[PDB]
Amino acid sequence: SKVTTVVATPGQGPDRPQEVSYTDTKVIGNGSFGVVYQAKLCDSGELVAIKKVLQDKRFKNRELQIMRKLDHCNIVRLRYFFYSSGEKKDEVYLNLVLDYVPETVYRVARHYSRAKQTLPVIYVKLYMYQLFRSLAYIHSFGICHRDIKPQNLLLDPDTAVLKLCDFGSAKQLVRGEPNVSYICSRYYRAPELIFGATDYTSSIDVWSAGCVLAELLLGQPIFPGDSGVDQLVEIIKVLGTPTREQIREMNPNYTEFKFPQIKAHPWTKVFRPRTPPEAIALCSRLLEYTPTARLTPLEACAHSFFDELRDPNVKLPNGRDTPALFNFTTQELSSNPPLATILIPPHARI
Amino acid sequence: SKVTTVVATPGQGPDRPQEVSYTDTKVIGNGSFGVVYQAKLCDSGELVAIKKVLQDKRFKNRELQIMRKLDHCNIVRLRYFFYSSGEKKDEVYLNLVLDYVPETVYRVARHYSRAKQTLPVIYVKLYMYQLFRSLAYIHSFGICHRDIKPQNLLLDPDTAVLKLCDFGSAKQLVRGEPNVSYICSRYYRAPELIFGATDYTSSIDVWSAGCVLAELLLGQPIFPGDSGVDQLVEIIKVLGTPTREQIREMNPNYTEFKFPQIKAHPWTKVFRPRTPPEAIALCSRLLEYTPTARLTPLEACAHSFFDELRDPNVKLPNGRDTPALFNFTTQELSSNPPLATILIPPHARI
Ligand SMILES: COCCCNC(=O)c1nc(-c2ccc(S(=O)(=O)N3CCN(C)CC3)cc2)cnc1N
Numbered sequence: 090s091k092v093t094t095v096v097a098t099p100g101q102g103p104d105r106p107q108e109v110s111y112t113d114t115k116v117i118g119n120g121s122f123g124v125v126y127q128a129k130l131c132d133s134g135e136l137v138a139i140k141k142v143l144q145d146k147r148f149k150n151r152e153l154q155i156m157r158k159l160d161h162c163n164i165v166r167l168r169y170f171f172y173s174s175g176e177k178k179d180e181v182y183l184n185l186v187l188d189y190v191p192e193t194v195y196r197v198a199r200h201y202s203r204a205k206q207t208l209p210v211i212y213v214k215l216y217m218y219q220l221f222r223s224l225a226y227i228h229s230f231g232i233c234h235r236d237i238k239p240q241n242l243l244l245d246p247d248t249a250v251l252k253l254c255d256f257g258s259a260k261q262l263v264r265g266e267p268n269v270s271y272i273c274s275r276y277y278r279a280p281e282l283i284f285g286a287t288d289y290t291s292s293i294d295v296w297s298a299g300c301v302l303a304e305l306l307l308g309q310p311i312f313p314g315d316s317g318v319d320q321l322v323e324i325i326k327v328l329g330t331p332t333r334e335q336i337r338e339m340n341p342n343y344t345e346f347k348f349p350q351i352k353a354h355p356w357t358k359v360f361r362p363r364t365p366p367e368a369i370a371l372c373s374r375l376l377e378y379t380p381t382a383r384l385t386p387l388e389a390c391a392h393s394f395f396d397e398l399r400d401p402n403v404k405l406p407n408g409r410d411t412p413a414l415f416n417f418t419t420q421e422l423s424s425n426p427p428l429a430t431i432l433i434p435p436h437a438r439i
Numbered sequence: 440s441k442v443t444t445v446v447a448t449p450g451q452g453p454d455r456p457q458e459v460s461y462t463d464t465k466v467i468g469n470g471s472f473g474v475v476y477q478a479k480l481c482d483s484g485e486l487v488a489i490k491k492v493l494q495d496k497r498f499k500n501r502e503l504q505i506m507r508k509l510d511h512c513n514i515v516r517l518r519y520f521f522y523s524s525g526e527k528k529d530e531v532y533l534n535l536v537l538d539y540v541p542e543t544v545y546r547v548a549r550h551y552s553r554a555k556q557t558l559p560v561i562y563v564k565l566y567m568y569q570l571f572r573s574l575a576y577i578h579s580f581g582i583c584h585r586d587i588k589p590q591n592l593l594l595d596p597d598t599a600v601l602k603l604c605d606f607g608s609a610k611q612l613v614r615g616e617p618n619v620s621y622i623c624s625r626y627y628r629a630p631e632l633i634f635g636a637t638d639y640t641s642s643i644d645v646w647s648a649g650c651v652l653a654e655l656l657l658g659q660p661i662f663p664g665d666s667g668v669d670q671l672v673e674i675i676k677v678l679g680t681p682t683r684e685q686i687r688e689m690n691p692n693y694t695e696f697k698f699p700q701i702k703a704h705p706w707t708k709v710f711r712p713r714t715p716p717e718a719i720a721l722c723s724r725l726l727e728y729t730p731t732a733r734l735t736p737l738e739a740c741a742h743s744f745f746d747e748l749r750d751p752n753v754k755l756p757n758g759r760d761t762p763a764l765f766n767f768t769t770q771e772l773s774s775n776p777p778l779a780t781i782l783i784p785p786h787a788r789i
Pocket residue numbers: 117118125137138140165187188189190191192193196240241243254255
């Protein structure tokens with residue numbers, strides 16, 4: 090087959106380029122970003138994904154700058170990066186060589202939906218916990234993903250490992266600095282975003298994660314609608330009408346606009362009867378109008394819902410051991426170091 | 440089988456309630472604020488749609504107040520309205536008895552898309568002209584639809600009559616007064632809305648109409664995306680990067696955030712080679728960054744693209760005559776009375 094050799098800089102460590110050779114190049118994605126390819130490294134045989142984006146000469150790429158700073162088991166690793174000329178002549182392309190993760194939460198949730206089944210609760214705990222770990226990590230550097238949704242949550246079906254991807258919308262949120270409100274995908278957008286707030290915090294990712302949890306429990310999105318107004322009606326139907334105080338906490342320019350007075354629906358009636366109460370309690374605490382009232386990713390990791398993961402006897406349906414879940418760093422725990430008493434169970438240290 | 444008799448007030452004219460009897464009640468829609476039913480009038484056999492929404496004593500219904508003021512051949516008519524109940528007591532329901540129009544532009548566009556075909560250009564002219572006439576009409580009263588999309592454009596396949604529906608998002612836009620930016624459905628939202636502008640005009644409906652025209656020509660939406668950012672990238676890919684002046688016209692709180700410098704793409708390369716040049720020129724003039732640079736609905740009606748409709752020999756593929764197209768009122772022409780020289784062809788008014 091066709092072998093491509095490049096002089097690629099490693100993602101982490103010293104800026105010491107290396108000759109990287111790859112083959113079996115197939116397109117696996119095409120979006121607003123650019124093209125995502127799958128390729129096989131000639132040396133190891135290891136599979137990788139290559140994200141190709143057109144680079145302006147104007148400034149450095151924000152996604153690369155973010156990717157270069159990250160190293161977490163629940164985040165797709167930037168292995169290398171290199172420049173090329175691909176489709177258009179006289180223009181540069183930045184190529185991000187990333188870890189290849191075979192499946193998405195989106196496709197898996199879709200399989201179960203189609204078969205009129207729900208994803209077993211063990212997987213809901215494994216996938217959600219791992220998402221909150223990745224969130225605790227990026228948030229500790231002040232970085233907000235801004236596009237949390239099932240399509241951006243990659244899975245290894247054999248190892249039950251989840252890895253966060255797509256750092257195209259990611260930004261370091263600095264207090265007092267304004268940010269675009271038009272980020273985030275329909276169904277997963279926090280009410281502050283729907284209200285066009287430019288002063289939002291990293292708690293927008295928490296709302297999105299909460300929407301993902303409720304969807305895995307229901308078998309469909311919790312807040313659907315093709316307009317902000319329809320989405321808001323669906324939110325109000327569950328959470329009840331937001332107070333004048335709750336509106337101020339999201340966007341204070343929408344306080345004088347009247348809303349339909351709907352009663353605060355009991356969260357227990359939202360989900361099927363078999364739904365564990367700790368799962369319902371977790372949604373309740375993540376899907377809050379007041380951005381500050383939402384659990385943090387690290388607090389979410391420590392929630393009762395994830396206790397089965399901390400059991401020393403927990404195993405995968407395939408018999409294998411659970412992936413890494415307790416290897417927390419000082420950085421990862423920085424928001425609340427005492428939480429490590431809950432997070433790291435006695436059997437963990439080895 | 441079941442016959443329902445009500446004392447309904449007629450939509451237009453004197454407040455003279457009448458006994459209205461209807462049967463064969465089936466649900467035809469379930470949306471944001473309630474249910475849409477189809478029913479047969481016992482005393483004509485004529486089909487109607489009944490929109491059932493929960494009413495608050497706090498305020499009069501905005502949709503009802505808008506509906507009562509309207510009478511146009513290209514707008515679904517409010518025949519009657521009455522009050523009743525449907526849920527667990529104390530709750531009052533407003534019922535809007537409307538004209539029943541059998542098909543939607545959405546379903547029809549979908550048929551052609553599935554058959555790998557495009558809707559014949561004669562229908563693109565007939566449907567788009569009629570939409571602009573309905574827009575010229577509502578806009579003449581200062582009323583903005585705010586949710587223009589294929590699902591809200593009803594059709595009679597035999598008569599080629601298009602009728603605008605859904606006045607749930609409709610509002611009278613008063614200059615200086617702020618309005619919610621979270622109205623309008625994904626794909627059809629004007630860039631000012633994506634940028635969270637609360638100072639938008641009725642030209643948002645023109646952008647939406649332009650998106651509908653381009654979609655009927657392409658066989659798919661012109662600006663897709665699940666996020667505002669993705670939609671904006673698709674807009675920039677066609678229109679080129681908006682200038683700081685153009686950004687100011689939309690939302691002057693986003694003039695500081697820098698955009699990807701993409702060249703102004705030629706509109707001719709957007710559509711298939713067969714596409715009429717006047718259709719391309721029309722999209723170009725409707726899909727403009729600067730809200731004031733967009734054609735008005737009445738100016739759009741008078742565009743070269745619609746000339747075939749003004750031909751005295753024009754007929755339907757089924758042999759029938761074209762529906763009413765030239766019966767303009769003083770109200771309808773009020774924005775620019777001289778346009779009637781183009782709009783009313785010599786053969787009309789002989
Ligand atoms: C997925 O979202 C794209 C955003 C950036 N992509 C990634 O970070 C990334 N994506 C993938 C990835 C791309 C496509 C899929 S998929 O749609 O499930 N898919 C299964 C395998 N097929 C052969 C191709 C089709 C599954 C994973 C793999 N490694 C990555 N490193």
